[PDB]
Design a protein around this ligand. Structure first.
Ligand code: HEM
Ligand code: HEM
Ligand code: IC6
Ligand code: IC6
Lengths: 449, 451
């Protein structure tokens, strides 16, 4: 009982606290002051921000709590539709799409995506080895080029060709602008018709590209090793039905958003933490050299990169790029023996604060020590949740980690890195997290592909 | 490519080399002569002893190598059964017991074990503060008293009362004698008529162990709930299969924890105190930390976590003389070790842990010096260079238990006493299945700080 609450803004309750360009970080500073739980009030909504493993492992009880759509996820739904990430658990299309798409995302399904992932990974390596002396690397921009191109090629055999462009592909231009307007609608129509006309024009740009690609593949009949094939041929064992063409569009849009932007933040945060801790970079570089013995990494070689994975896990601990998820109480219940919640009450899991629970991780929560994950079974349950919870956890988790391990093992194998600007960490907030302005210099090790 | 091999004894191959009372140390002298790898042959067995970080970091690749039961562990299994340490990874009872028992061994579970550990640690401090002038401390004997009573109290709320005894508890008499007979079966022959007294004694030794443990399980199964491992085993259920441990396996786990607890963890404290009195500057720094941290009459769980240098002291003692000195591995498929030693599926490897921890390419030239400052940054240490607790999912489950018990007890010892190596003790390491500094004695001068 007696739940804390931050300062109010008259009739707006706590909403202006999110009237800032780093609201997740602002919410972490509140959680540092107010503790394990605090109520957030806005006009028309009330939520509770959870920050401790003690409270979150109860919220992760799927028998008592189910996934809720946050205001951010509801606004994305205006173009992501009933895709996996923006649908309710009880909606017929979630379980339908979920069952069709799990065999395509398994760890054994990555053996087929591997060849296409190396296609994009080589493009990144070759861009950096074609730089001139004293030229630097814009890390998140090149990381976004690789993650967006990877899900496009593996998901529906489409080449955005991001490494041939300065300005992004027109699809990604509108997608980011739709995510931009969705995020701005949170802390927000007197003078918004321009904003809305731009919003609907960006949705039509996205829908047209995907709908032609689905129409092209069906008419051509060509079969590939991409998700688009599994969706046209896959049939849900429960209902016996396949996904209709509209849902397929929403899933591809979902994979393009939910894929690239969170997965490039992981690589950007990983490389940042590697150049800020030279001892960790050396251990990771030693493994990349010993394991990746061929000019072209194999699926089995990527799985042997244990320390690269621990580097990735510890980067996901300090700065998880999909930083929060929402839950609602399925019935009346009591949280932590002290916080009564009524049916339908909402919870928010502040993932970066969970990953700083000192009673779980010790006192050095802010230090980058990948050795925490040396034994993955030792970590308590529901203490480390960068990929959500339960059946509503990330379906592309094995995808994102295999790509990030392959690319990081390749960057560490082929290049020496220099934090030539002594970069000060500046985290940009969209729907995800990215280290803005992060640049490095790469000194090629002259190992051919 | 061609693997070295030590001297042979005709039809016995290399086995008479282990017909010695310090076989791990003898194996270290071979590794100094033959280098990073050498073949050890015995009648019916062949293994390869790895000693360098370069080859061991590959042997720790669990996708290529899994834990093997060494000839020692096969003999221990005759009473440890399919307990955690003597069962194969593919055996159903390992994964089951592994999932049920992991939450009771976490760093967060030690907050509940802490009070009971302090119970035993205070008994040790008060024994030493009740000695008379010119009386000394038999160090490994008193450290074993503490580790055995700690695992008995925290594991199943049973008091061996080792600080009330001259002769050891009747349980360990067979327990310790069974390990001795198990170790002797190695450098022995197979079963002949002559070794019958050994065999009748062996089965009577197991019956002592099984009867004591099974009564404790039957006694508890009162309905009383405790904060001990036994409670978690009777009520815990594996999330995978949904099944709990049966009563046969449960005694095997208690027997395992009783073995795997006291003797390995008391050698660590014994070796720690040895290296501290042999390096007065390190002892002083560690004693200063104990003083500026342990400000209460009873150390807290958070205070033990703040004993950074004591932890570095313990790790450095585990580097020079790890008390579980070796473990066994087998190749899951045909593979090549270090690009020059092809291994077939099922071939065995041995990690000589004390030789690994002397790899000059990792630790420099002062490998033999006791410098706890090596462990100031765990990320600086190369991968798989430091393996006192095994490897992977088959690593030591009681790592946080043993280190919390040793850090609390060592921090309390450094706070309350000044120590004097009054005999200029010459290190004589006795070998059983573990390592202990035999005959190690010190004098303790109370600092007169009350509890
Ligand atoms: C490291 C990068 C990524 C992170 C941190 C991440 C994180 C998450 C999280 C936390 C959720 C659950 C959100 C919720 O509670 O509602 C989620 C859902 C999802 N993610 Fe990811 N994700 C990543 C990359 C990807 C990729 C590459 C894909 C595939 C293209 C993907 C596909 C999905 C899908 C389909 C869902 C919805 C699952 C469902 O509705 O049941 N994610 N992700
Ligand atoms: C510093 C003291 C200790 C050392 C040096 C040590 C050493 C080891 C080693 C090397 C292993 C792996 C053996 C293998 O490769 O198969 C191991 C496993 C094990 N240890 Fe310890 N240990 C210590 C303390 C403890 C304590 C206090 C307990 C609990 C009473 C314990 C319980 C176990 C168990 C249950 C296993 C088996 C783990 C498994 O099978 O997955 N150990 N120990
Ligand atoms: O972060 C979220 C929603 C998280 C969406 C992540 C996007 N995703 C989901 C699955 N894969 C990617 N919700 C909070 C915090 C916040 C407020 C304003 C601006 C940014 C973040 C809120 O609604 O208040
Ligand atoms: O003994 C062993 C392994 C014994 C390790 C300690 C047992 N343990 C491990 C964890 N908790 C207890 N490995 C070799 C070398 C050797 C031979 C004879 C005598 C001593 C050592 C072998 O068996 O041949």
């Amino acid at each position: 009982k007696e739940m804390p609450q931050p300062k109010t803004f008259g009739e707006l309750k706590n909403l202006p606290l999110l009237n800032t360009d780093k609201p997740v970080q602002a919410l972490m500073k509140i959680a540092d002051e107010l503790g394990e739980i605090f109520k957030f009030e806005a006009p028309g909504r009330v939520t509770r921000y959870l920050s401790s493993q003690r409270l979150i492992k109860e919220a992760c009880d799927e028998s008592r709590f189910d996934k809720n759509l946050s205001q951010a996820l509801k606004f994305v739904r205006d173009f992501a539709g009933d895709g996996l990430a923006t649908s309710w658990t009880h909606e017929k299309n979630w379980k339908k799409a979920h069952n069709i798409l799990l065999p395509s995302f398994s760890q054994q399904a990555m053996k087929g995506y591997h060849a296409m992932m190396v296609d994009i990974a080589v493009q990144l390596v070759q861009k950096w080895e074609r730089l001139n002396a004293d030229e630097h690397i814009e890390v998140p921009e090149d990381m976004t080029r690789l993650t967006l191109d990877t899900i496009g090629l593996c998901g529906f055999n489409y080449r955005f060709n991001s490494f041939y462009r300065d300005q992004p592909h027109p699809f990604i231009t509108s997608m980011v602008r739709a995510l931009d307007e969705a995020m701005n609608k949170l802390q927000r129509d007197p003078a918004y018709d321009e904003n809305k006309r731009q919003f609907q024009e960006d949705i039509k740009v996205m829908n047209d590209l995907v709908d032609k690609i689905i129409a092209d593949r069906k008419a051509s009949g060509e079969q590939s090793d991409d998700l688009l094939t599994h969706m046209l041929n896959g049939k849900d064992p429960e209902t016996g039905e396949p996904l209709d063409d509209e849902n397929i569009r929403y899933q591809i849009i979902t994979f393009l958003i939910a894929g690239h932007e969170t997965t490039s933040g992981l690589l950007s945060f990983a490389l940042y933490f590697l150049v800020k801790n030279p001892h960790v970079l050396q251990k990771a570089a030693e493994e990349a050299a010993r394991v990746l013995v061929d000019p072209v990494p194999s699926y089995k070689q990527v799985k042997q990169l244990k320390y690269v994975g621990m580097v990735l896990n510890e980067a996901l601990r300090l700065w998880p790029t999909a930083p929060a998820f929402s839950l609602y109480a399925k019935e009346d219940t009591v949280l932590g023996g002290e916080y009564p919640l009524e049916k339908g009450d909402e919870l928010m899991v502040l993932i970066p604060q969970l990953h700083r629970d000192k009673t779980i991780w010790g006192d050095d929560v802010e230090e980058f020590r990948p050795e925490r994950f040396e034994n993955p079974s030792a970590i308590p349950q529901h203490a480390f949740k960068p990929f959500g919870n339960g059946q509503r956890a990330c379906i592309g988790q094995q995808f994102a980690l295999h790509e990030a391990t392959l690319v990081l093992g390749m960057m560490l194998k082929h290049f020496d890195f220099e934090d030539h600007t002594n970069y000060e960490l500046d985290i940009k907030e969209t729907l995800t997290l990215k280290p803005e302005g992060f640049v490095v210099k790469a000194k090629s090790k002259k190992i051919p592909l």
